[model samples]
Target chain A: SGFRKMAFPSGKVEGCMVQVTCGTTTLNGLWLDDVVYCPRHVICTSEDMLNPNYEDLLIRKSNHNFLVQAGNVQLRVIGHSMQNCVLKLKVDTANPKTPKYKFVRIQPGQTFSVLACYNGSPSGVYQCAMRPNFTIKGSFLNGSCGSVGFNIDYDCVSFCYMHHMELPTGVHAGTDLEGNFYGPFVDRQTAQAAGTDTTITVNVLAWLYAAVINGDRWFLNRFTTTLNDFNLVAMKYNYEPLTQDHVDILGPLSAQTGIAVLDMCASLKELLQNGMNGRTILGSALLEDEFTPFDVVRQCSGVTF
Target chain B: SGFRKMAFPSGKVEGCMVQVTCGTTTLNGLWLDDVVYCPRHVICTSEDMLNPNYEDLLIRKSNHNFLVQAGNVQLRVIGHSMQNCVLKLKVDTANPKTPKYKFVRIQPGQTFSVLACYNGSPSGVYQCAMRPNFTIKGSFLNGSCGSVGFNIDYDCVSFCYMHHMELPTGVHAGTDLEGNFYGPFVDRQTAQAAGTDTTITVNVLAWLYAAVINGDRWFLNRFTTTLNDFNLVAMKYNYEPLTQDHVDILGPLSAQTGIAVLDMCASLKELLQNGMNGRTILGSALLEDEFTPFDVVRQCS
Candidate 1:
């Protein structure tokens, strides 16, 4: 019921490197909320739900906004704690043009956001590097910024749309299309219309839709229940458009899509605007898929949406 | 390098309950592609890229599509290993009018789809029900049929269109709108002519486009690298279009939207089609926003 304390490798060396401690607590089996797993020496704040396994946790990666519930959980760097404690919050921020929001200063009674800056990062990887350059006036000087591997949107799109599209047809069949197929012009128009000067784009809708439909179905079918029942259902039923409703019949599926949409939108905007670059975004996006919907769907179907 | 084996639960489990076995192995931590945990009573057939944690591994809830991968994996009934381990796999094979896929045989290789069948399951819970009447097989069997709660399309539409509209007001303050408050509409005829089915009801073009655009963008933002930096870039970089070209010059935000779109699209389809209902489809034209761009334009510059 409360924040249980677990121990992990503190990203800190003995002498001066930041010591990082970590732990994995079961929020609800595969569902872990309010997680903090970033790089060392960085100031971070994770809110309600972050599938560190995916990019949705990164505010910019998902293009969605997050509200820090309570006061920022501060790690009081005790005597040797600073040297032995490197706290890194791991998140998958696949979006670009958006900024990683942060809480300026959080008290025990108030919560804030942690906007991860992604200017200097590795290619195709979304990361928030921690910089221990803090102001230490007398005992505390002035501090500035560090770097991390952040940015991986295009890679994610390519893998799911193009790569996954190439996957042999299972129960149902269709092609997976790239999001950029919507053409640059359309993408630009949409991006401009969204209020930011950044170019937002899209590709084939049918191909995209087909991917969403079959991919989710495959995951849900294979993992949620048992191999036997899933097979029976697949063999028994065929595609039924009329009988399906987004709210009831497909509510969970829709919700999964919803969560993905919000996270990606926010992340893309953050990366694009922040100018996190290419390789970082691409790598991050690619890795995010392995952690997100597949995991969240597995956990949330039984718990809260 | 190899599938690490962890100690299995020594305690006696009930007739139908499944327990998580502990193990460790090297795999990709990126996007959770790495393998760390092993599944019980089933075999996972995904490409051996890495050992997967429970979150990363994909399997059916009921069908018997699993093959024993490695290790001494078996199902024990009340501490005794059952001889006939395979469960009967059936479907409602009746006519289309009153078609029902019922159990036929305990085949060698059958895949199960969660949420569709395995009736009489307990509400808001995943454990198999011990209800004798509902029990399809053995003393204990998986009852969840494997499905998550909530809907993805709802949020997909919400974020896609809303993000587009927010850009002009929040980022770009240059473009001027025509005298009209409403944007151009993509005629129904045009959509129909483009091989879109008009007989069956579907969303409008604008809405559909909105869904794709918004859904795609949202997907990228939530599950990629452009998470935090993108937001700061927007505020500091002035007005700029986020593209997928050069990472150093324009930053890596370009690919953010595309990645999100494709990933979400893939996941959505996988869950819906392979899930309980089996053959579910999502429409891309349901995108709509409570507030319009006209209001934002007026409010900004």
Candidate 2:
């Protein structure tokens, strides 16, 4: 009763807060060894399996097409509401002083999507789908917006739930059934175990969690996402737009529902430094009206503390 | 007293209204045939030949950059002001329905630039300079804003006074010493005499004239340029911004100073349809308080 199955499959690893049940015999032994032995049998068993809010692609329009295509990863309108216009996305590459974020436009009744290509472009698809879990809404680039528009963090670490090393070299990234993307780097666990930089930048966390950008309303919603279903980190702090100053670092939105204000990115540097690293979380995040990804994520199953 | 010389040398040919006077030993008879005889004794004997308003480059900036680069030719802020915010530039490619243009921002005391390269990029410079005449301020793309931000005319006529044929092959364009560019086409005179499509689209006028963009103020100013100093066409029409409608095609700004509405693109389609193809102009174009290319280009040399 203390846990539940995540709507999506978890990595076939053992000794973690997230557990999956192997219902059949051949698959039963497959669940042994805490390793991903068989390719097929996978599940996230514990609490009620609930899918995150998502929608079909809205690729047709007469006006502007607000989009973000970084390397082989792409994030488009997945879910939205309110004429409030509160979603924002950032791109940081190698510089620190330059800001590379754009305010996304999401009209009512719209939804966003996610994609990662192994072939090096949007058309070179590895995995694609309409909806999925995980988001990078509250991360940072800690980098600059070099010419390519969105710097997909050159020096940042990558943590992949899927075995990215299995793909062809130069595959760029991969996606699951719901089109959630991960790995501008091969894999986070693969790199960390092999001794790579573990200092989690917003870019690293963003790719690890299978983050897909989602947004709505004026209260500041991040329209970016992750590969795995990510829970709310303890201190998601907002930064002042023009000045680039750290405003207030707050806990869960459910805790301070009436008093919080919305703005730009939450400093990833702050969250990792203050003891959020290596911790698991429960539920997602959300705002008061229930339209922002902040609220929709809370309804899904996540690796919670 | 009947006619004088143009400021810069005219095309070395038996021309209509421009002339050259040669007085030297070997070049003494160079003015005999008007065929650019010596390629050296070139001159424009008009009323009072003058250079257009221009400045040294102001490439440094702490705020924003307002610029445009199409194919090999480039245009930038040559003049500005008003804290006024009025300059606009349009870009149309193969599609006639799409609009590709931008509103340029020029703060006080700032200047613009112009460049054309025979090579593929800005680094591949054929002509680079601080300023010169020719403004495409009132032209049209006659196409769509396709993928490329600006659709330089794919089918416009070129009128080069300079021998574009003299440059290496694949050389997109050539520019004069002032960095003014002409001949995305070999040359207007060359092509017209050779019997090419001479329909004269907005793109044609923009190139023929060596148009450089300039702007300022809340009134409409186009931040584009041409190779030569162009005269004000009798009817430089303005297009409505959002809806893309053809607004009034008014006479020269000096004629109806207080009455014209300022907006977006002039219908190159409309301008060509009216009787403007074979006319030679005498002055430049501009709005009142100066500070604009519209006004600065009016001053010079």
Top of the candidates by TM-score: 1
- Give per-residue CA lDDT, model 1, range B1-301, as digits (tens): 0000011110010011222211222110000011111112122234432342322332223232322111123222111111121122122121122111121221111111111111211111111111111111111113222111110121120000000011111110000011111122121112111111111001111112233333332312233334234423333422122233212221112232243422333333332233313121221111221112211111111
> For all the predictions, what are the DockQ values?
0.02, 0.00
Give the whole-model CA lDDT for all candidates, comma-separated: 0.18, 0.19
- Which runs in model 1 stand beyond 4 Å of their true positions? A1-37, A40-75, A79-305, B1-142, B145-148, B151-301
Model 2 bad stretches (over 4 Å): A1-115, A118-120, A123-154, A157-305, B1-54, B57-301
The worst-scoring run of ten residues by lDDT in candidate 2 chain B lies at B1-10
Best by lDDT, which number?
Answer: 2
**Per-model fnat list:** 0.00, 0.00
The digit string of per-residue lDDT tens for model 2 on A1-305 reads 01111111111111111111123211110111121111111121222113211111112211123233322333232322211111111222221212222223222111222111111111000111111112111101111001010111112111122212222211122222111233232222233112111221221222212122211122224422221212133223221121111112222332323222221223233333342332322212211111223222322222110
The TM-score each candidate achieves on chain A is: 0.16, 0.19
Give the per-residue lDDT digits (tens) of candidate 1, residues A5-49.
011111110001111222221110000122222222122234322
The clash tally of candidate 1 reads: 251
| Local error of candidate 2 at residue A74 (angstroms) | 26
